[PDB]
Amino acid sequence: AVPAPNQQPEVFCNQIFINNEWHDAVSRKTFPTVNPSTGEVICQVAEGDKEDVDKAVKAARAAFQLGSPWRRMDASHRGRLLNRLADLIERDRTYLAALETLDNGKPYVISYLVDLDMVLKCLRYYAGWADKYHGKTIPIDGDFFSYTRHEPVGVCGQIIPWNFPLLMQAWKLGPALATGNVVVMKVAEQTPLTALYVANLIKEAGFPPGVVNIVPGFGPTAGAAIASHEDVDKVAFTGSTEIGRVIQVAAGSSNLKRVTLELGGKSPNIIMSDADMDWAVEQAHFALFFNQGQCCCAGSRTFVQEDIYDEFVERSVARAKSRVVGNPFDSKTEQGPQVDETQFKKILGYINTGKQEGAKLLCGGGIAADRGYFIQPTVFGDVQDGMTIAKEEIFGPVMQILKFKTIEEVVGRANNSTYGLAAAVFTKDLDKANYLSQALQAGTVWVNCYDVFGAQSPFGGYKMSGSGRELGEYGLQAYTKVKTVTVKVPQKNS
Amino acid sequence: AVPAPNQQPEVFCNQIFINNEWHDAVSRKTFPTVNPSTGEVICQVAEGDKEDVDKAVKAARAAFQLGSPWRRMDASHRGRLLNRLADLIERDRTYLAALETLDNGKPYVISYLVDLDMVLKCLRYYAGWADKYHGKTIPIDGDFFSYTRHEPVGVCGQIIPWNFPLLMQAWKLGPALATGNVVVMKVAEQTPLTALYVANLIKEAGFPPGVVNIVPGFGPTAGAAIASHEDVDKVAFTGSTEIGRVIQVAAGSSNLKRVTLELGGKSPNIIMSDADMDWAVEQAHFALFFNQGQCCCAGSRTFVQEDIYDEFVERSVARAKSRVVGNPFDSKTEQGPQVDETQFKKILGYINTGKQEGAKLLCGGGIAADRGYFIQPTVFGDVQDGMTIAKEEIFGPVMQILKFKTIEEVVGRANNSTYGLAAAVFTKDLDKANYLSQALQAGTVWVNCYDVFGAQSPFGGYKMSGSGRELGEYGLQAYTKVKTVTVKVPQKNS
Amino acid sequence: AVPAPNQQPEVFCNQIFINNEWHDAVSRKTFPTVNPSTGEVICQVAEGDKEDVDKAVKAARAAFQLGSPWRRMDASHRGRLLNRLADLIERDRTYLAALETLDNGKPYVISYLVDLDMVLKCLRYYAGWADKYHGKTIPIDGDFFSYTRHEPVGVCGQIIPWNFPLLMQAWKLGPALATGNVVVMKVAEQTPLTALYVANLIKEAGFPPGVVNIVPGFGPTAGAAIASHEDVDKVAFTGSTEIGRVIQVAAGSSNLKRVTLELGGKSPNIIMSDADMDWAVEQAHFALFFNQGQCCCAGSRTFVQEDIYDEFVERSVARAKSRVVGNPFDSKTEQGPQVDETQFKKILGYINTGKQEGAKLLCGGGIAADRGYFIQPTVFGDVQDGMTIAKEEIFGPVMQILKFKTIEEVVGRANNSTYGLAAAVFTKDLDKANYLSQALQAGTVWVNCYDVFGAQSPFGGYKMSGSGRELGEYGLQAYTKVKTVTVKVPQKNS
Amino acid sequence: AVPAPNQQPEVFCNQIFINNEWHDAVSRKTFPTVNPSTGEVICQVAEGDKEDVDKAVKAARAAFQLGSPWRRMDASHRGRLLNRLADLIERDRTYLAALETLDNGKPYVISYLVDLDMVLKCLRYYAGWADKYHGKTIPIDGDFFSYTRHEPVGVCGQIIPWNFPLLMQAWKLGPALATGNVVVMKVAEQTPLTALYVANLIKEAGFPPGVVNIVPGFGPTAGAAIASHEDVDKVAFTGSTEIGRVIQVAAGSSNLKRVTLELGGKSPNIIMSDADMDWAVEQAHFALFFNQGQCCCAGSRTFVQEDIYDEFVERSVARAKSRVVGNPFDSKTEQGPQVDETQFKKILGYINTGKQEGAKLLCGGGIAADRGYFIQPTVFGDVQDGMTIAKEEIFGPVMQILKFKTIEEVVGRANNSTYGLAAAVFTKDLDKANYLSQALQAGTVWVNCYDVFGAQSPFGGYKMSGSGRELGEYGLQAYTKVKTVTVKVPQKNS
Ligand SMILES: NC(=O)c1ccc[n+]([C@@H]2O[C@H](COP(=O)([O-])OP(=O)(O)OC[C@H]3O[C@@H](n4cnc5c(N)ncnc54)[C@H](O)[C@@H]3O)[C@@H](O)[C@H]2O)c1
Ligand SMILES: Nc1ncnc2c1ncn2[C@@H]1O[C@H](COP(=O)(O)OP(=O)(O)O)[C@@H](O)[C@H]1O
Numbered sequence A, B, C, D: 001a002v003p004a005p006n007q008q009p010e011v012f013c014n015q016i017f018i019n020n021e022w023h024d025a026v027s028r029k030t031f032p033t034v035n036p037s038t039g040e041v042i043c044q045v046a047e048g049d050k051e052d053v054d055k056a057v058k059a060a061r062a063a064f065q066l067g068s069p070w071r072r073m074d075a076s077h078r079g080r081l082l083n084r085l086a087d088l089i090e091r092d093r094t095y096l097a098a099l100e101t102l103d104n105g106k107p108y109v110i111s112y113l114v115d116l117d118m119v120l121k122c123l124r125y126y127a128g129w130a131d132k133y134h135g136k137t138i139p140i141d142g143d144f145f146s147y148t149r150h151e152p153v154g155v156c157g158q159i160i161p162w163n164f165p166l167l168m169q170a171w172k173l174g175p176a177l178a179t180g181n182v183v184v185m186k187v188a189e190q191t192p193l194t195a196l197y198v199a200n201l202i203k204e205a206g207f208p209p210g211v212v213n214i215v216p217g218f219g220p221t222a223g224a225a226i227a228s229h230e231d232v233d234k235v236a237f238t239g240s241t242e243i244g245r246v247i248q249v250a251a252g253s254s255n256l257k258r259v260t261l262e263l264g265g266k267s268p269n270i271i272m273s274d275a276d277m278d279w280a281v282e283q284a285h286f287a288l289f290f291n292q293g294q295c296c297c298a299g300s301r302t303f304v305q306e307d308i309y310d311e312f313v314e315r316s317v318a319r320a321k322s323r324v325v326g327n328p329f330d331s332k333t334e335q336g337p338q339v340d341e342t343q344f345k346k347i348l349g350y351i352n353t354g355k356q357e358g359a360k361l362l363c364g365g366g367i368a369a370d371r372g373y374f375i376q377p378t379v380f381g382d383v384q385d386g387m388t389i390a391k392e393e394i395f396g397p398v399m400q401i402l403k404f405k406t407i408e409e410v411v412g413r414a415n416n417s418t419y420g421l422a423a424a425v426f427t428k429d430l431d432k433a434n435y436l437s438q439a440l441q442a443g444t445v446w447v448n449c450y451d452v453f454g455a456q457s458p459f460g461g462y463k464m465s466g467s468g469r470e471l472g473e474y475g476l477q478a479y480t481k482v483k484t485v486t487v488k489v490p491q492k493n494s
C-alpha cells in the first residue's frame, strides 16, 4: 500500500533557515550532498558556519523574548501548530519519503511506511503534551502558598545525525516546541535535504519567525558554534561518543548550558534456549540489519545459548544471504547503500579487522556493487568479548554472534561494555525474562521484540551511551525549567 | 522470632471514643464480645447508637473547622503524628497481637508477624504521603493563572469488618489522616477491642480531640446512622455486598455524600498445566485457607487445567488434612476458629449445600471441636460453575476445585461472576501470564503468588465488588476534594 | 468575524442513534421540540423509552467486548478519531451554531464564537490525553513486580441538560472516549437536535458502531432507564439537585454503578472595595446574565462591600437596562429567550417571590416580548441571606446584589449555602485574594474574572453541588478503573 | 526554648569514613580546622586525596553491586533507615548545633532552631519518598506491554560547601539515599566536623557499609578526584561558579557522568512602593544578613521604589546598626564571624571596592573585633548596576540598596545578571506580584517573604546559577535512571 515514488525528487530548499526566510551562508560557500546509491552529487547546500549560527541564535532569542507571539501563545495553540505541521508532512508524505531515500539511501518503502509514519506519530503525540505538562502546588510548612511553573529552557541547540534525518528532527522538535522553547538546529551534512524542506512546512504551518532555525553545515564549524555559544541555553546532541565528549566540554567551557547526549552502543540481543526459533532468528536479523545497520541501538552483539547456537547461526546466515541489496527505490530492496564513502570504508575496515582477529566469516564480507556504497550482509560467528568487532560500534550490516552457557554468565557479558543504550531478550519463560530485564544495564530492554519505539516510551542510555531521555513524558523534562513561587499568606489551612 | 503472648490480655478500652475521651453510650447499653476460641464472653462494650454517632460527628466537624489545630497543622506534622502512632503501636505490638487473637480468633503468630507488621507498614507508608500529594498549576488558555488545591473531603464515616480488625482500621485511618480529614469510625461488633485500644494510642500520639472518633456498636444502628447522617461528607464501607447496597442508598437519600465500597468476592485462582506444582499447591492452599478463609479476596475458585488436575487435587487434599486446627495461641496452630456463631453455621450450611448439589467432598466437612467455632479444612472436587458453592462467598475454610481445558475457556469462566475483587494465575509462560492478567476482570491479578498486598499498591474491585481503591497513591484520591483557583493576570507568558 | 447564519437551519437527524444507525422509537412515538424564540415547533423527534435504552446499552456492551475494534484500537488512534470528529464539527461550525441557537435560544454569535469554539477545544484537548494517562510501576515490598493498568470503566450512561447542548455533549464524550469507554447518552428533551447531528459526524469520523449511542427522550423514562440499568457501569449526570438524588438512589438500588453529579449552585461573586470598578461591574454582569442566566455556576449572589455598594449598584442597573434582548439571530442581541415555557414561568415565579420578600426591584421584572420566552434583565437590591431569591437557583436573568462590611463576614455568608460549585473575588490586594480563594468552599474560585473554563482545568462542586470533576486530567479519573497486577519475580533489585 | 550549649564541644570524628570505618589518609597527612570566632585551631582532620577517594568509590561501588544488602533492601526500609538517622540526629541535636557553631561560626540559637530543624525535616521528608517514586506503564502502539523502572544512578559524588555544613549534607543524602544510590561525599575543609559526626550516626542507624563514604580534604585534591573519577556515575556540586565550571569540564573529560550545579547568585529583592514598610525592611535585612551573608541566594541587590527609598534606607541603616555582632554562643548574638580568613579579606576588599566606585557608605565598612573574623554590618546606598558590588557575589554582611522607578524597569535590571538563583518581591498588589513572579528569571521567586525553603519545594537556578534542582519531588529526578522495558504480548486490549 505504498504510492509510486519520484525516483528523482526535486529539491526546493538548500539554504539556511532563519526567521522563516532562506539565506545563503555569510561566506557564500556551499557544500555538495551525495546520493549514496549512485555516488553522484544531488545538489549544493549552503555551508553554515559560526556567523550563521550567531544570526540564528539571535533570531531564536528574539522569538523567545517575554511578550513575543511565541511566548504569549496559548499552550494549546502550540499543540495546534504541531498538529498542523504533522498534517502538512502527511500531505507531502510521498515526496518527503522519496527525498529521504535519495539523500540517505534507505529503502523508499521503509522511508514511507516507517520513517514518515513515526514522524507523524511523534509530532502528533507531542502536540497533545503541549497543554498537559503541569507544575505543582506544594504543601510546604508554614503560612505560605508554594507552587512550581514549568517554563521553557530557552534557546535549544539541536545537533542531529544522518541515520534517520526526518525522525531525529521530529524527536527533537516535538518536545522542544510542545514546551515552548525555540530551536537552532544543525542537521547532518550527509542528509540536510528533508529537514530543510520541513523547515518550509514549519513556515507554512504558521510557526512565528525564529521559533525554529535550521543551519546546515559541518560539525566542527556549525555544530561546535552552537555547543560553545554563550546565548544557547541547552544543547541536545545525538551521534558518536567521540563528539559527545567535545559537546560536553564546550558546554562547561562556555555558559554551563544544559547537555543531553544520545550516543551509540553495542547493544546485546540475548537469545535463550527456549526462545521461539523462527521469531528470534527473524528479529535478530532485523535487530542488526535494520537501516543498513546504521542504528544507534542495533543488536550488534547477538548472544545465543549453546544448545541452539548451531541451528540459530545456520538460519541467520541463510537469512543474511537472502537479504536483497540494491536500488533503494526498488520495492524488493531490503538493504540500500551506507550513508557515505567515509562510513563505507570504516565498515570495510571493521570487516577486515574481524577476519584478522579470528572471527569466523560465515557470509558476505565485501562490496556488493561497483556503484554506490553498497555492502554485503556480513555475519561473523564464534565472536569473543575481547575482539574489536565485539567492542566497537561498526554501524553497518555486520552481525556478530557470540555463544554462552548460563543466564548468570550472559548478564555479566552483556553488561561488560562502556555502552548501555539498549538490550533484548528472547525467551518464553516468565522468570528468565524478568530476571534479565532487571539485570541488564540498558536504557531500553526489549522482550521478544526489538526496535519497538513508541512516541510514548522514553529512549536513552546508561553509562557512556549518554544522559537524559527522549520520547514520552520524560522527553519534556529536558526542555523545562522549574521555577518555584512561594507566597506568604494570611493563615494556611489544609 | 515471636515473643510469648499473654493468652488472657487485659482489656482497658471498651467505651465510645469521642474528642479523645471515653464515654458510655447515651442509652447506657452494652453488648458482649465473644472469644471465638472458647465461646466465652471477653467483656462488655458500650453499644453506640444514632445519638452517639451524632455526638461523634459533631466532634469531628468541630475539629475540622477552619482555623482549628488539625486544619492549621503543617501537612508534614500530620506525617509526624502518623509515625508517632506507628511507634506506639510497635511498642504495644505483643499486647495488641494477643488481643487481636483473643477477639478475632486468628493465630497469634500470624497476628504478630502479619497483621501488626502490615499495620505498621501501612501507617508509616501513609505518614510519608502527608506532604507529597500535590495539586497542579494548569496551562489554561488566556491571561490567567490556574491551579488546583487538594483539600480534605471533611468528616469521613468509616465502617469496617471483623476479618482484620487492626489492619482494616489502619487502611482507613492512614489515607484519611494523611490527607487531613476527620473520622467517625464504626468497628465490627465481633471485634471492637483492638481498634478501641488503638484509639487510646491515637490520643497518646497527640492527634487533636475529634480528629478520630470510634463508635462501637451494631450495624443497623450505629453504622446506618453514619451512612445517613446529614453532616458526614463521605462514607467508606467494607463488608458484604448486601449491606454495601444499603449504604449507597442511604447516601443518595441523605446528602449525596461520597461512597466507596469494598465488597467481597469469589476470586478465581487459575493454575495452568506448566505451573510449578509444589508452589501452586502451597499458594492455592494459602490463597483460600488464610485467616480461616475469612478473607475478602480468598481464592474460593481454584481452576486447574485437566492435565494436572488429579495430581493437584491429591496434593491439595493432603495439605488440607495436614492443616493444624486448634488453640490460636499455640505456635503449631495454622487455623483458629471462625469469628462467631453466625458465621459458624453459615459455613456449615454452605458445606451441606455443597454435598447436596453434587460436589465431591474430598475431606473435612464438619465441626473440628466441641468448644469454639472450629471447622475442619474442607475441600470440594469437581465443582461446576452453576453450583451454589461456586457462586456465593462462603468466607470459610472451604476450598472449591474446578477443572478446565483451554486458556480461552477459563478466562470466560473466571470472568463470569458478579464479583471482581482479585484473581491469580500460576504459570511459567510469559505470554500466558500477560494474556491472563489482561483478560481477567479483577482489581488485582497475582501471577505466581497470592495475597501479596503492599501498602504501596492499590486494592479494590470491579463490578459488584465495589468502587474506589485503597492503598497506594490511589487511596488518597478518595479522601481529597479538588479546588481550582483561576486568577486573571496582566499578561500570560510560557 | 462571524459568518452569516441560516436563520432556519434544516434538521437532518431526529431519531434514536444506535450502532451508527438511525432508528425510530420502539413505541413509534415522537415529541416536538420548540424554538424558544417563537414558541413554534421546529420538528418532531423520536421519543426513546426503556426499550430503546435497552437496545442502546446492548450495542454499547457489544462494542466494548474484549477483542472488539474499539477495545483493540491503539490509544493513539482514539485520539485520531476525536481529532477527526473535531475537524468535522469545525467544518459544519456555522450550521451547528445556527441549529444550537434555533433549539436553545442563545445568541448565534455566542453559539459560534463561544460554544462551538469550546467544543472544538474540548475534543482536541482530550484527543491528546488518549495515549498519555499512564498507570504505575510500584516499588512494593518483597520479590514482586507490581504495576497498575488504567482500564475503561465500561458502558457509561451520560444524561445531559439543555443550557449548553453541544458543550455538555463534548465535555462528556471527550474524557469518556479518550479513555476507551462506550457511551449511552440521553440528551435534554428541550435541545436534542445538535447532539443528534453530532452523532452523525461521529459516524462519519469512523468511530466503531456502538461506541456512542444517543437516545433522545424524556427524563423519567429514558434517563431513569439508564440510571437503573443493570448493565450500565457508570452514570454521569448534570442537572438539578432534585434529579441528582434520584440518579444516586437508582444507582444504589441497581448494580452499584459509579455516579458523578454535576448539580447547580448559588455561586457567590464577591466584590471588595479596592476592586477595579469598571471591570467588576462588567464581569458581575456577565457572571450572572451569561446564557440567559441559564448557567450552573452563575454568580447569582453578588456580594458588594459597603463603601462601593451605591456606585456598583448604580452601574449594574444601567448595564442591565442597556442589555439588548431580542432575536438571537440578530448580531445586536445580547440576550435570547429562556429555553422553554416551564423555565419561563419558574423565573417569573421567583421574580414575584423576590418582590414579596422585601428585596428592592431596581429594574426589569417582567416579560420582555409577547412572542417567545423573553424575560427582562432583572436586578434586585439589598437582598438578604434569608430571602428565597438568595437561596434557590433561579437559572434566569435575575441579579441579586447583597451588601457586606468585612472580609471575615462575607466568607461565612458566601459559604453558608448547600451549594459549592463556584465563587469569585474581585480585588487588587494579594492577601485578600489568597485569603478568600482559600476560605471559599467552592470547586472553582475565580479571582478578578468569571466563567473562565479551560478544557485543561477541572470543574466540579463541593457539598450538594455534586461529586467528581470534569475537564483536565481529573476528568479522566472518573472514566477509569485501576487494575493492579502483582507478579512474583526471582529476586528484586532497586 | 533553646538548651544551654557546650561552648567547647568534644570532637569524636576527624578521619576518613569508608565502609562504616574510620581511616587516616593514605598519606597520613592532616589539616587543621579553625574556629572562626577565635581564630584558634579546633583540631586536626585527616587530609584525603586521590588515593582516599579511590578507596571510597570502590567501597561505594561494592555496596551498589547487584544482590548487595543496599540493592535488595525494600524501598520502604530505606525510608526507615533515613527516619532512624533523623532520630539519632535529633537525639544529639544540642551537641551537633554547638559543633556547627564552633566550626562554622553561625549563632548557636540559629544552628539549633534553624539548621538542625531543617536537617530533621529534610531527612524525614525524603524518608517518605523512598517508596513513592513510581515508574510508569505506557500505552504504546501495537501488541506490547511497555513500562519504566526508576533505578538508582549509582555512585554519586557529592561535593558540598561550608555555609550550611549539616543542611547541605542532608540536602544531598536525603534524595540520594531515598532513591537507593551510594555516596562519596567531600565536605568543605572549613567545616568538616559536623558531617563527619553524622557519618558516625549513619553507621549507628544501620546503613550498610559503603552506602555513605565521607572524605574530608581540599578541593583541588579530593574534590577533583571525585569529579574526574571513572567509576563515579554522578557528581553534585554546590559552591562557586568558578569551581562549578571545573567540575563540568572534569566530567566531560572523564566518563560523561551526570552533573548538577548549585552555584551562587546576586539575587534581587524588589520592594514596591505599596509594600508593608515594617515587614519589607525586616525581611530585606534578613534577606541579606542571614548567616553572616554567607548564603547562596542572599538578597544582595535590594531594589527599592523611589517613593519609599529614603524611608526604607533610613530604617535599614538603623536595623543594620542595631544588629548585634559577637560570640556566636551568646543568646543575644545575631551575627557571628565569617567562615575563615580568606573570606574575611575578600569581603573587606569588596567593601573597599564599593567606596572606590562611588557607592555611598551608610554604615559599618570595617572590622568588628580584634579577634575572630568579624565584620560590621555594612550598607551601601545609591548603588548602580555597573558597580562591582552590584555584580559580584560578596557572600558577606554587605547590603546594596538600588533605586528604581517603574516595574517594567526593575524587571529588566533584576534580570540583567549572569545569576538567577532566587529573587523576591514585596507588594500588596495582586497584579504586580503575579507580573513580577512570572517576569523574574530566577529558580525561586518569593512574594512578601524571603529564604522560605520547604523540604517539599524545589530549589535551583537559572543561567549560570547552575542546572538541576534540589528538594521536593524534583530532587529525585537527578538521582534516578529511567529504564524502559517493552514486552511483546499476545493481544493488547484497553
Ligand atoms: N552559593 C553557594 O551555595 C555557595 C556556598 C558556599 C560558597 N560559595 C561560593 O564560594 C566562594 C568562596 O568559597 P570557596 O572558594 O571555598 O567555595 P567553592 O565553590 O570553591 O567550594 C565548594 C566545594 O568545592 C570543593 N572544590 C574546590 N575546588 C575544587 C576543584 N578544583 N575541583 C573539585 N572540587 C573542588 C571545595 O573543597 C568545597 O568542598 C564564596 O564567596 C561563594 O562565591 C557558594
Ligand atoms: N445495615 C447496616 N448499615 C450500616 N452498617 C452496617 C449495617 N449492617 C452491618 N453494618 C456494618 O458493616 C460492617 C461489616 O458487617 P457486614 O458486612 O454487614 O457483615 P455482618 O453483618 O455479616 O457481620 C460492620 O461495621 C457492620 O456492623
Ligand code: NA
Residues within 6 Å of the ligand: D288, D293, D294, D295, D298, D300, D394, D395, D396, D397, D398
Ligand atoms: Na552576601
